[PDB]
Scaffold this motif. Structure first.
Motif, PDB file in Angstrom:
ATOM      1  N   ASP A 187       0.849  -1.178   0.000  1.00 38.08           N
ATOM      2  CA  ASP A 187       0.000   0.000   0.000  1.00 38.08           C
ATOM      3  C   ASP A 187       0.890   1.234   0.000  1.00 38.08           C
ATOM      4  N   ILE A 188       1.743   1.305   1.007  1.00 34.01           N
ATOM      5  CA  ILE A 188       2.646   2.419   1.198  1.00 34.01           C
ATOM      6  C   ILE A 188       3.420   2.740  -0.084  1.00 34.01           C
ATOM      7  N   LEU A 189       3.982   1.716  -0.732  1.00 33.93           N
ATOM      8  CA  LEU A 189       4.717   1.908  -1.971  1.00 33.93           C
ATOM      9  C   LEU A 189       3.811   2.494  -3.049  1.00 33.93           C
ATOM     10  N   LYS A 190       2.560   2.030  -3.152  1.00 25.91           N
ATOM     11  CA  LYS A 190       1.633   2.560  -4.146  1.00 25.91           C
ATOM     12  C   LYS A 190       1.501   4.073  -3.985  1.00 25.91           C
ATOM     13  N   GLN A 191       1.405   4.492  -2.723  1.00 32.85           N
ATOM     14  CA  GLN A 191       1.132   5.869  -2.352  1.00 32.85           C
ATOM     15  C   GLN A 191       2.343   6.793  -2.560  1.00 32.85           C
ATOM     16  N   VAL A 192       3.583   6.328  -2.307  1.00 36.07           N
ATOM     17  CA  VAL A 192       4.759   7.205  -2.315  1.00 36.07           C
ATOM     18  C   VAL A 192       5.549   7.108  -3.616  1.00 36.07           C
ATOM     19  N   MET A 193       5.406   6.018  -4.366  1.00 32.27           N
ATOM     20  CA  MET A 193       6.131   5.899  -5.620  1.00 32.27           C
ATOM     21  C   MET A 193       5.765   7.027  -6.584  1.00 32.27           C
ATOM     22  N   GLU A 194       6.750   7.376  -7.429  1.00 33.60           N
ATOM     23  CA  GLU A 194       6.555   8.255  -8.573  1.00 33.60           C
ATOM     24  C   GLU A 194       5.676   7.529  -9.598  1.00 33.60           C
ATOM     25  N   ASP A 195       6.182   6.393 -10.105  1.00 32.40           N
ATOM     26  CA  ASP A 195       5.536   5.591 -11.138  1.00 32.40           C
ATOM     27  C   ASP A 195       4.266   4.926 -10.596  1.00 32.40           C
ATOM     28  N   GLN A 196       3.508   4.294 -11.507  1.00 31.36           N
ATOM     29  CA  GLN A 196       2.400   3.410 -11.158  1.00 31.36           C
ATOM     30  C   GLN A 196       2.933   2.081 -10.631  1.00 31.36           C
ATOM     31  N   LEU A 197       2.493   1.697  -9.425  1.00 27.75           N
ATOM     32  CA  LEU A 197       2.919   0.434  -8.846  1.00 27.75           C
ATOM     33  C   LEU A 197       2.440  -0.745  -9.693  1.00 27.75           C
ATOM     34  N   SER A 198       3.404  -1.488 -10.230  1.00 27.00           N
ATOM     35  CA  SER A 198       3.165  -2.688 -11.008  1.00 27.00           C
ATOM     36  C   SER A 198       4.006  -3.807 -10.404  1.00 27.00           C
ATOM     37  N   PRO A 199       3.779  -5.089 -10.765  1.00 29.94           N
ATOM     38  CA  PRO A 199       4.507  -6.198 -10.143  1.00 29.94           C
ATOM     39  C   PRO A 199       5.999  -6.328 -10.473  1.00 29.94           C
ATOM     40  N   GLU A 200       6.541  -5.454 -11.341  1.00 31.39           N
ATOM     41  CA  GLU A 200       7.957  -5.480 -11.705  1.00 31.39           C
ATOM     42  C   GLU A 200       8.674  -4.255 -11.127  1.00 31.39           C
ATOM     43  N   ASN A 201       7.907  -3.180 -10.934  1.00 29.75           N
ATOM     44  CA  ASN A 201       8.336  -1.930 -10.333  1.00 29.75           C
ATOM     45  C   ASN A 201       8.736  -2.061  -8.869  1.00 29.75           C
ATOM     46  N   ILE A 202       8.353  -3.168  -8.215  1.00 31.50           N
ATOM     47  CA  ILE A 202       8.692  -3.346  -6.815  1.00 31.50           C
ATOM     48  C   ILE A 202       9.262  -4.726  -6.559  1.00 31.50           C
ATOM     49  N   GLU A 203       9.769  -4.839  -5.346  1.00 32.87           N
ATOM     50  CA  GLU A 203      10.511  -5.995  -4.913  1.00 32.87           C
ATOM     51  C   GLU A 203       9.964  -6.251  -3.528  1.00 32.87           C
ATOM     52  N   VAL A 204       9.592  -7.496  -3.254  1.00 36.50           N
ATOM     53  CA  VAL A 204       9.064  -7.787  -1.937  1.00 36.50           C
ATOM     54  C   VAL A 204       9.665  -9.081  -1.483  1.00 36.50           C
ATOM     55  N   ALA A 205      10.006  -9.150  -0.216  1.00 38.04           N
ATOM     56  CA  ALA A 205      10.497 -10.389   0.329  1.00 38.04           C
ATOM     57  C   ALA A 205      10.031 -10.462   1.757  1.00 38.04           C
ATOM     58  N   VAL A 206      10.053 -11.682   2.290  1.00 36.92           N
ATOM     59  CA  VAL A 206       9.656 -11.889   3.669  1.00 36.92           C
ATOM     60  C   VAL A 206      10.561 -12.928   4.265  1.00 36.92           C
ATOM     61  N   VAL A 207      10.830 -12.768   5.535  1.00 38.31           N
ATOM     62  CA  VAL A 207      11.401 -13.872   6.240  1.00 38.31           C
ATOM     63  C   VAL A 207      10.327 -14.303   7.206  1.00 38.31           C
ATOM     64  N   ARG A 208       9.887 -15.549   7.009  1.00 33.11           N
ATOM     65  CA  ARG A 208       8.808 -16.153   7.755  1.00 33.11           C
ATOM     66  C   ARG A 208       9.334 -16.676   9.081  1.00 33.11           C
ATOM     67  N   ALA A 209       8.559 -16.448  10.157  1.00 37.74           N
ATOM     68  CA  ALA A 209       8.945 -16.843  11.508  1.00 37.74           C
ATOM     69  C   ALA A 209       8.981 -18.361  11.652  1.00 37.74           C
ATOM     70  N   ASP A 210       8.030 -19.024  10.975  1.00 36.50           N
ATOM     71  CA  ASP A 210       7.789 -20.451  11.107  1.00 36.50           C
ATOM     72  C   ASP A 210       8.984 -21.255  10.588  1.00 36.50           C
ATOM     73  N   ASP A 211       9.390 -21.074   9.317  1.00 36.28           N
ATOM     74  CA  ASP A 211      10.535 -21.815   8.780  1.00 36.28           C
ATOM     75  C   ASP A 211      11.854 -21.094   9.081  1.00 36.28           C
ATOM     76  N   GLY A 212      11.777 -19.768   9.283  1.00 38.00           N
ATOM     77  CA  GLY A 212      12.953 -18.930   9.454  1.00 38.00           C
ATOM     78  C   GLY A 212      13.737 -18.737   8.156  1.00 38.00           C
TER      79      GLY A 212
END
Ligand SMILES: O=C(NC1CC1)c1cccc(NC(=O)c2ccc(=O)n(Cc3ccccc3)n2)c1
Lengths: 229, 234, 202, 271, 229, 214, 232, 226
Positions: A187-212
């Protein structure tokens, strides 16, 4: 600009090259980090300069180790240096103690390289966020060019940061799910980015607590996040 | 040793010495890289062709290893140093790991040398951007760019030097994936002629295919310049 | 110590005993002598246990940094070459290591021997250790590329067993691993004395 | 002390390196040197400074190793310099060692273009590291190697270098270039190149005749090999011809300078 | 500990510190040299500040080795640096080749030291010129070395204060036929031209290269030459 | 003059399911003589749940012990207060022994403690760090006596008789007393006393135990 | 000001502005207080207080050895350097003498380290103030240190932002501290630390650290269980 | 630009950065010292800024060896640097030469060390004068090394802000006759007169001596004599 040497304090007790390195981090693409009990999330505006760029190559999120990720803002090449050191340090820790490095210990050892300037001509113009999962569960820290780490629960760095610290203050609670986090991130990225948020314009990762373990969202899985909003 | 700090942040976050290295790269001759299905095409502007320079072929696209080729823009002599380092790195690597260096590995090495020189006391930055192109030992082609900040990035096509961004804006519009060898060479020639004057004696052009690197003869090139300059009227 | 490995059509088998002698007294019947470096690469330990444990652990670290730095697993040839360059650099410092490095990279299965002097050899079959002289006898006679994966582990297990039975320094538990396209599996552990009773049931 | 650092290896605002631009200015003040690369050899013709009648010769025993403008780097490599003379000698000594280290290691002559890269790497260094001023020197190198034949490079203080068929450094290099453009061609004898070198040199320093006193000429050409000592290494191959750097005495040069007066008299008839 | 260069190019291409060092080196007192068919003579004014200086202790002409000598103009102590180095070089060369260093090689060695101080960091150039006079297998020689590190073989010349006029007067009186008695006579006559006050065997020094050796005339030997001028 | 001296004695540990017991005898020997019957230097607490034991040269175990004690303090500080696990210290020790490869510590070490699951463990080392986990352990002068006996009573691989229950911590302790006692009888360099340390989650009991003084 | 750009430059009135400026770094760090009783020393440091539901640890307070530890204010990264230094010097000392490094000697050291950074070109003052609390054979100690290299031996002190008010508070009560119990020392610290809070913020377990050290009490940063006891 | 580095002379052959460091010493708290026939006494006014210092804080008087001490005047940290160097010289004398360092030697060494930092662009002069008080084999000795590194022996000496007055009061003493007992009284008394009360409200007077009664050991004087 060579009037004042680089180790000089201002009259307010700030080292000038540090304050300037910080100014450079406000020119950077927005990155952000959200601690949840299910895991941590990092997300970055890629801010590519052309459609002709291969977006995987402008990777603002980096595996430090199986359980640690970092995301830079500012001078990317400077960030490659820090992350190389983190990688080396995290691996020296496994080598030596046969266990995964804590996230804090890692952030420390990345700040340990940022103290060094007089050696390095200048500070790194880079802020990292370093998400990870260790024994104390998911964690998110921020390095600065000062060399001062700081554990956070949610953070932004970059041109976004001020607008994105507005939104965290309102919508972030210490108890959200990993999916509500992914969502608030994007959400935040959609709001602050210059460009239109698309699935290539951003990078997302997570480290999950369960598997670590750390998962880098492919463009597909980032659409799967944009879906529900 | 002299270790004064040359590259330093100014007030508004900028590293002037790196902005000025980049200014030295905007004064340099254009170079262009294009990535097709089975080919990378590197094309560069030559300075002209004064009747005095040696009519023996001097390449302005440099071989770094068997599989990897590098064009540059900016200070010739800085470039030459970077390249020698790159050459020597690819051998160090063969020698340590038996395998040949992936292109991306070579690019990262070079970009790190560039970055390192924006942070080493005593030294100014290299005033050099590079385009680097080649194939890994798995038939996949790559094309990269480094700028003087030490930032690299992979591209489908790219330009460096004078009017880089005019040329890149052009290429964004046209460029399609999965071009042929011949459509690549065309596209590169077309793209260069956006800023170079004739296509006569002021374009060297290199074609990289898996395991085979081949410069256009001045004759083969001219069939392409007519085929292209005739397409620019329209 | 007896270690062996071979390439066949199905992959690579690796097999080892578990005894660590301090000359004549047996320090351990339970050494693990296959080091799982990565999860596509194994190495064996023969020679100085510390030397192998240490430098194989380093190799594991170099393999992993490769993977972080370059986004892709290191090839076996490189891995072995890394270790060979270390043992070469230290050829004058009396390391005792005889090592195999087995794995399956994008070029298929690969097996190297790397010793303390920096030798690095790539054959389809090797045995290493005091008891190698025995294991090759049983191995050289049964080895074929077209072995199944049972027949190849049987062969590998028997060869180690025969080494254990005859050679004072080898012994304990015969462990067998397989290295195939999706990584490696530990196929089996067996006490060499249970194996005596299985192979020779009078 | 840092307040007084002139920051020689910094960029300026247009990505210019001022110390290198100004070294170049220093070179455009120097005695002109012309080089002409034929296929029978290479010619260097240089403007000496005006010969005060109290100058002596150093009376060196080997006449071909050095003059005022021309120096031998190796049997197969000569040069001529324009710019800060003393900087030249520092580099010249470096080029000599380099060429002989190459020969130490490989036991064959260093190729001209590698000698040249070595030299210009040494210059590039001073434009990037070290906080001192650059070498304020431009070579013309010449020589012969089996890879490319007669060659003629020229270097700049930046460390760039370029191969040429003919070229000029020093005083009126722009003017001399324009004049070589017109009169150079691919099939010149040595005598033709010696002529062209003098016509241009005499045209840049504004003389009716060539002033033998103010001109040095060197030639790099292959000559029969004398000291084939073949019983001494039987397996070694000795080429029939070998490169020779030659500096012309005033007498060897007199004919060639007359012959360039005659093609300056026969070019003021058409007018 | 200062490592930046002090001598640098200026927009016209000039190395100004070296012009200034050259200015300094022509502010000395007059020294001059005359080469002849069978030797060389160098000669300097020793203008002692007061009569209370022990003029024996002022050395303006110096032996560098048995066969070669120098004198100098400009800053004495800078020149003392060069002379010390040149003496060492003469001796290093003998140690290696067990022959005397040829003057040409010696001067190139000096030239090189001068050049280092025009480029190396932290240092200013030398503010003195030398004449070097000597005899080797190629005969008699006389060289001038300036602070640029440039050097010139001469048949006769003069450095220091009265030097333009002294050079002009040597141009007339010099002949390629000259023998050494006449050379000395000419050298001493040339000094005397621009000499404020009587010349004495106290306030002048003279060196000659004769046969195979360089020697500084005694006051006895110099007095016999000063009774004939 | 050697830089190396064997000061003798013997350590042994036995792991249990929620405890580990570690023992060293207190004799410190010199050349042909006895320096102290009361040396407690062989056993060294590293953290509440991890101990090391060392045989060989008393001087080198004092050095080693301090080197480790400081790596453990660094670790605590660099990891926001937490203590390194037994397995981490075990790997650390292997790495430190090996870094001296060239002029080695003349220690035969054990690291013992509790794994994460709270189970006892023992790592034994050679002089350069070859280790491995085991359920028991004994280094030193009596090792080659004790080790086969523990083999026999713990593993029972040559007994038809079905293996008795898991040994409690009282029974385990008796077993080590019986085996120290027999060693003191027969190894002339072991005797005097044995310090036992029973490590559990709830803390570490100490227990001294007299051996025969001759 | 022609004289304020270099640590090697005296001003004509005999000042060293780079050192006065490093002091500013300290006056602008988060407040910290320490007090010294008969047997104990208490450090209390303000941290940074949650931005809604949104925390933020920074390590202000550091243990340095069993018997000593410290609280910093100013440039945290300098803190860490100093902490690493002190830790290391204390381990060397304890290695050599098998006992803790005595505080007066450690204060001598930390002050010499600072001086080494205010006299040469391209070093700079530490921009960090320390309270160092520790206990040895001579009893408890509390030192404040400053960029200038000075080391003060205090009975009570505070530093950082708005810490003037903390010092006003401590000046009323400090003469009693030699008789107070550990609980009243801690009360007194917290009270003082609170006179330094901005307007209507108050002390609680998540914007306040407390460390104590003293007789038979290794230096101990207080966590959320033990802290709560004292903060109510 | 004549005054930014101690590596530079002004046109009158002054070195301003040294004069400036000098001013640091003159704006500092006052010290006095007297060299009697039985020993040396040195006293110094410590000015606190806080009411809450421990007594002992910011000692300006340091022993450098058994028989010698240094009272610093000016920037205390800079002085502790000198004190460290003096101590290394004293140790050297004992370790290499197996003798206590004579006081003239110690003060020369101190001076050389201070002077060194007035010659090189990279360091600044010290902002402190050291008073050195010795009683080794050369007898009772009192030197002062100032920031220029100039060293001088004195019978009595006064530094810091009240130096001009304190010297007037020290001139009234009879150095030929005066004893270390009397001097502790006088020198302390002097520092109470010249202390300015409405400026520097908090102050103790630290005193130390090395004398025949102290077994020629340099020590703070017991706080009964003050
Ligand atoms: O076990 C070792 N030392 C003793 C101290 C434990 C020990 C220590 C170092 C190396 C070895 N090698 C071998 O034993 C061995 C024996 C047979 C054989 O075929 N190979 C493989 C090979 C392949 C090509 C060339 C050379 C060797 N290797 C052992």
């Amino acid at each position: 600009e060579y009037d004042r040497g680089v180790n000089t304090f201002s009259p307010e007790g700030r080292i000038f090259q540090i304050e300037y390195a910080v100014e450079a981090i406000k020119l950077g693409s927005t990155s952000l980090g959200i601690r949840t009990p299910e895991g941590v999330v990092l997300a970055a505006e890629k801010r590519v300069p052309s459609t002709l760029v291969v977006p995987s190559s402008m990777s603002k999120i980096m595996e430090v180790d199986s359980h640690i990720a970092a995301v830079m803002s500012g001078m990317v090449a400077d960030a490659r240096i820090l992350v190389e050191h983190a990688r080396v340090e995290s691996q020296n820790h496994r080598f030596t103690y046969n266990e995964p490095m804590s996230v804090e210990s890692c952030t420390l050892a990345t700040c340990d390289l940022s103290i060094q300037f007089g050696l390095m001509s200048r500070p790194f113009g880079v802020s990292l966020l370093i998400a990870g999962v260790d024994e104390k569960g998911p964690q998110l820290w921020q390095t600065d060019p000062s060399g001062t780490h700081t554990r956070y629960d949610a953070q932004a760095i970059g041109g976004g940061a001020e607008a994105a610290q507005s939104v965290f203050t309102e919508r972030y609670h210490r108890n959200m799910t990993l999916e509500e986090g992914e969502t608030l991130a994007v959400d935040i990225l959609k709001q602050v980015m210059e460009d239109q948020l698309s699935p290539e314009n951003i990078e997302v990762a997570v480290v999950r607590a369960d598997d670590g373990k750390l998962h880098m969202y492919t463009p597909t899985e980032i659409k799967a996040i944009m879906s529900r909003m | 040793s002299y270790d004064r700090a040359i590259t330093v942040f100014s007030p508004d976050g900028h590293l002037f010495q790196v902005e000025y290295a980049q200014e030295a790269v905007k004064k340099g001759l254009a170079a262009v890289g294009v990535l097709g299905s089975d080919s990378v095409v590197i094309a560069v502007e030559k300075k002209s062709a004064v009747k005095l320079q040696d009519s023996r072929t001097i390449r302005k696209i440099y071989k770094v290893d068997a599989n990897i080729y590098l064009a540059f823009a900016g200070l010739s002599a800085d470039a030459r140093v970077l390249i020698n380092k790159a050459q020597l790195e690819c051998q160090r690597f063969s020698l340590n790991y038996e395998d040949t260096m992936d292109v991306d590995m070579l690019v990262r090495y070079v970009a790190g040398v560039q970055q390192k020189s924006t942070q080493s006391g005593g030294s100014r930055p290299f005033g050099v951007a590079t385009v680097i192109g080649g194939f890994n030992e798995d038939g996949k082609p790559h094309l990269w760019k480094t700028d003087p900040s030490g930032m690299c990035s992979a591209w489908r096509a790219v330009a460096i030097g004078r009017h880089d961004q005019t040329v890149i804006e052009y290429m964004e519009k046209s460029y399609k994936d999965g071009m042929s060898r011949d459509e690549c060479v065309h596209f590169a020639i077309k793209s260069l002629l956006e800023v170079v004057e004739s296509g006569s004696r002021n374009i060297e052009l290199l074609v990289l295919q898996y395991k085979e690197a081949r410069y256009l003869t001045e004759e083969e090139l001219q069939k392409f310049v007519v085929e292209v300059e005739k397409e620019r009227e329209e | 110590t007896t270690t062996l490995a071979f390439r066949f059509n199905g992959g690579i088998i690796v097999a080892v005993d578990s005894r660590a002698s301090t000359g004549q007294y047996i320090a351990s019947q339970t050494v693990m002598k296959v080091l799982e470096i990565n999860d596509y690469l194994l190495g064996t330990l023969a020679g100085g246990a510390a030397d192998c444990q240490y430098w194989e652990r380093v190799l594991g670290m170099e393999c992993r940094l490769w993977e972080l730095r370059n986004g892709s697993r290191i090839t076996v040839a490189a891995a072995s070459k890394i270790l060979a360059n270390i043992t070469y650099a230290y050829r004058n410092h009396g390391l005792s290591m005889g090592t195999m490095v087995a794995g399956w990279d994008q070029f298929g299965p690969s097996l190297y021997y790397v010793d303390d002097k920096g030798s690095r050899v790539k054959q389809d079959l090797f045995s290493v250790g005091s008891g190698s002289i025995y294991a090759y006898g049983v191995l050289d006679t049964g080895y074929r590329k077209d072995l199944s994966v049972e027949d190849a582990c049987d062969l590998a297990r028997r060869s180690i067993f025969h080494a254990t039975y005859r050679d004072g320094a080898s012994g304990g538990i015969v462990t067998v691993y397989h290295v195939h396209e999706k990584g490696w599996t530990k196929i089996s552990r067996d006490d060499q004395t249970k194996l005596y009773h299985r192979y020779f049931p009078s | 002390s840092h307040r007084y650092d002139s920051r020689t290896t910094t960029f300026s605002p247009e990505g210019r390196l001022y110390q290198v631009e100004y070294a170049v200015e220093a070179i455009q003040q120097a005695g002109t040197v012309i080089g002409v690369c034929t296929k029978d050899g290479v010619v260097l013709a240089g403007e000496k400074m005006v010969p005060h009648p109290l100058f002596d010769s150093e009376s060196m025993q080997d006449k071909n190793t050095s003059g005022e403008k021309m120096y031998k780097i190796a049997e197969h490599i000569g040069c001529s310099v324009a710019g800060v003379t003393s900087d030249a000698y520092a580099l010249l000594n470096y080029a000599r060692l380099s060429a002989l280290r190459h020969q130490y290691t490989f036991q064959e002559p260093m190729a001209i273009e590698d000698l040249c890269r070595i030299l210009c790497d040494e210059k590039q260094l001073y434009t990037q590291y070290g906080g001192v001023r650059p070498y304020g020197v431009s070579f013309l190198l010449v020589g012969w190697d089996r890879y490319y034949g007669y060659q003629l490079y020229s270097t700049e203080p930046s460390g760039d270098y370029s191969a040429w068929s003919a070229y000029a450094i020093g005083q009126n290099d722009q003017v001399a270039h324009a004049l070589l453009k017109k009169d150079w061609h691919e099939s010149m004898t040595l005598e033709d190149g010696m002529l062209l070198a003098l016509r241009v040199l005499g045209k840049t320093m504004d003389t009716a005749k060539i002033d033998l006193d103010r001109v040095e000429v060197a030639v790099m050409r292959k000559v029969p090999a004398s000291n084939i000592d073949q019983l001494l290494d039987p397996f070694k191959h000795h080429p029939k011809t070998t490169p020779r750097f030659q500096i012309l005495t005033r007498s060897e040069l007199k004919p060639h300078a007359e012959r360039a007066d005659q093609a300056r008299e026969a070019e003021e008839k058409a007018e | 500990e200062a490592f930046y260069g002090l001598t640098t190019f200026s927009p016209s291409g000039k190395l100004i510190q070296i012009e200034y060092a050259t200015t300094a080196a022509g502010k000395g007192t007059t020294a001059l040299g005359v080469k002849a068919t069978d030797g060389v003579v160098i000669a300097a004014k020793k203008k002692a500040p007061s009569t209370l200086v022990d003029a024996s202790s002022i050395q303006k002409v110096f032996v560098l080795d048995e066969h070669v000598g120098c004198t100098y103009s400009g800053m004495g102590p800078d020149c003392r640096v060069l002379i010390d180095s040149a003496r060492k070089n003469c001796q290093q060369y003998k140690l290696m080749y067990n022959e005397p260093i040829p003057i040409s090689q010696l001067v190139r060695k000096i030239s090189a030291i001068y050049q280092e101080f025009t480029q190396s960091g932290g240092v200013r150039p030398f503010g003195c010129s030398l004449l070097v006079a000597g005899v080797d297998a190629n005969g008699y020689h006389l060289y001038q070395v300036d602070p640029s590190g440039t050097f010139w073989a001469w048949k006769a010349t003069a450095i220091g204060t009265g030097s333009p006029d002294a050079k002009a007067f040597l141009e007339k009186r010099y002949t390629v036929d000259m023998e050494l008695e006449d050379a000395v006579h000419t050298a001493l006559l040339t000094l005397k031209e621009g000499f404020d006050g009587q010349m004495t065997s106290e306030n002048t020094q003279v060196g000659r290269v004769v046969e195979n050796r360089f020697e500084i005339l005694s006051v006895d030997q110099l007095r016999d030459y000063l009774d004939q001028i | 003059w050697s830089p190396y001296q064997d000061n003798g004695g013997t350590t042994a540990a036995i792991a249990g399911k929620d405890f580990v017991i570690l023992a060293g005898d207190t004799r410190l020997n010199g050349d042909f003589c006895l320096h102290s019957r009361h040396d407690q230097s062989k056993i060294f607490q590293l953290t509440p749940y991890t101990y090391m034991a060392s045989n060989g040269m008393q001087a080198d175990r004092l050095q080693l012990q301090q080197m480790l004690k400081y790596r453990v303090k660094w670790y605590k500080y660099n990891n926001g207060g937490k203590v390194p696990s037994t397995k981490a210290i075990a790997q650390l020790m292997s790495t430190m022994l090996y870094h001296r490869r060239f002029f080695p510590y003349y220690t035969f070490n054990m690291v013992v403690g509790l794994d994460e699951e709270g189970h006892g463990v023992c790592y034994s080392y050679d002089a350069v760090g070859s280790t491995e986990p085991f359920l028991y352990g004994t280094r030193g002068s009596a090792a080659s006596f004790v080790e086969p006996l523990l083999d026999c009573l713990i593993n029972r691989q040559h007994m038809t008789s079905q293996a008795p229950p898991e040994m409690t911590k009282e029974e385990t302790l008796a077993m080590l007393k019986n085996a120290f006692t027999g060693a003191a009888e027969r190894d002339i360099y072991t005797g005097d006393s044995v310090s036992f340390f029973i490590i559990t989650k709830d803390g570490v009991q100490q227990e001294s135990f007299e051996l025969r003084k001759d | 000001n022609e004289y304020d750009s270099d640590i090697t430059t005296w001003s004509p009135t005999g000042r060293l502005f780079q050192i006065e400026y490093a002091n500013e770094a300290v006056n602008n760090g988060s407040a910290t207080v320490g007090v010294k009783g008969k047997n104990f020393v208490v450090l209390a440091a303000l941290k940074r207080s949650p931005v809604a539901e949104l925390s933020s640890y920074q390590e202000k307070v550091f243990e340095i050895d069993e018997h000593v530890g410290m609280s910093i204010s100013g440039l945290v990264a300098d803190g860490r350097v100093l902490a690493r230094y002190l830790r290391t010097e204390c381990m060397n000392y304890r290695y050599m003498y098998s006992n803790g490094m005595p505080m007066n000697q450690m204060a001598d050291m930390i002050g010499e380290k600072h001086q080494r950074h205010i006299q040469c070109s391209g070093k700079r003052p530490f921009g960090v103030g320390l309270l160092l609390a520790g206990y040895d054979r001579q009893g408890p100690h509390l030192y404040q240190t400053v960029p200038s290299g000075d080391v003060y031996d205090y009975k009570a002190t505070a530093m950082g932002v708005r810490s003037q008010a903390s010092r006003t508070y401590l000046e009323r009560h400090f003469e009693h501290f030699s008789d107070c119990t550990l609980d009243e020392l801690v009360t007194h610290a917290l009270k003082a630390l609170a006179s330094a809070t901005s307007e209507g913020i108050e002390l609680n377990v998540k914007n306040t650290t407390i460390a104590i050290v003293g007789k038979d009490t290794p230096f101990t940063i207080f966590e959320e269980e033990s802290a709560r006891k004292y903060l109510d | 630009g004549h005054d930014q580095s101690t590596d530079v002379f002004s046109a009158e052959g002054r070195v301003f950065q040294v004069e400036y460091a000098g001013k640091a010493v003159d704006n500092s708290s006052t010290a006095v010292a007297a060299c009697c026939k039985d020993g040396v006494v040195v006293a110094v006014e410590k000015v606190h800024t806080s009411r809450m210092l421990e007594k002992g804080s910011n000692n300006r008087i340091h022993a450098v060896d058994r028989q010698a001490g240094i009272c610093i005047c000016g920037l205390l940290p800079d002085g502790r640097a000198i004190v460290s160097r003096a101590r290394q010289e004293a140790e050297n004398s004992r370790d290499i030469f197996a003798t206590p360092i004579r006081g003239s030697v110690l003060a020369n060494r101190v001076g050389e060390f201070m002077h060194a930092y007035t010659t090189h662009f990279a360091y600044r002069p010290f902002g402190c004068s050291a008073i050195i008080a010795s009683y080794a084999d050369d007898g009772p000795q009192l030197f002062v090394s100032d920031p220029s590194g100039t060293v001088a022996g004195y019978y009595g000496v006064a530094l810091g802000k009240a130096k001009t007055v304190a010297k007037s009061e020290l001139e009234k003493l009879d150095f030929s006759s005066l004893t270390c007992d009397e001097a502790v009284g006088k020198l302390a008394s002097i520092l109470h007169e010249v202390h300015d009360k409405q400026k520097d409200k908090l102050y103790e007077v630290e005193v130390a001596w090395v004398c025949d009664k102290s077994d020629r050991k340099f020590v703070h004087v017991p706080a009964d004599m003050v």
